[PDB]
A = this chain, B = another copy of it.
Amino acid sequence: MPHIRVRGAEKEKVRDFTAGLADELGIIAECPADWFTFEYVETTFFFDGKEDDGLVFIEVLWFDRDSEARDKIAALFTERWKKITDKIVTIVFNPLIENMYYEDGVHF
């Protein structure tokens, strides 16, 4: 792990968000920077029958860590996006289960 997914933001803004990001995340999560992936997810928000700006919605798929690491990642992500948008920044952490996760055919 970890796998970060962003929806609700422009693709190029997601690319820019990732500059230096795996270094910082690796330090906070105490794991190598190379264990991080980042995606822009292609979606469209709607509300009451119209196109909506939605929000910036970020999923973090990882082997869970304590709340201190989680809280710091949330703060970091929120601070970074708030520089570019006044949209709400929403972050959900999704704990992976080791025996349900495979990398190249074996557990991680």
Oligomer: number of copies: 3
Instruction: Tell whether A90 pairs with B103 under 8 Å between CB atoms, given A39-B43, A43-B40, A48-B19.
Output: yes
Closest chain B CB from A62 CB (angstroms): 10
A67 near B105: Cβ-Cβ < 8 Å? no
Closest chain B CB from A55 CB (angstroms): 7
Give the A interface residue count (CB, 8 A).
55
The contact of A37 among B3, B19, B47, by CB within 8 Å, is: B47
Interface-centre pick from A18, A37, A42, A103 (highest chain B CB count, 10 A): A37
Q: What residues of B have a CB within 8 angstroms of the CB of A47 in the complex?
A: 18, 22, 36-38
Measured CB to CB, the residues of A under 8 A from B are 3, 5, 7, 11, 14-16, 18-22, 36-52, 54-55, 57, 61, 67, 70, 74-75, 78-79, 88-96, 99-105
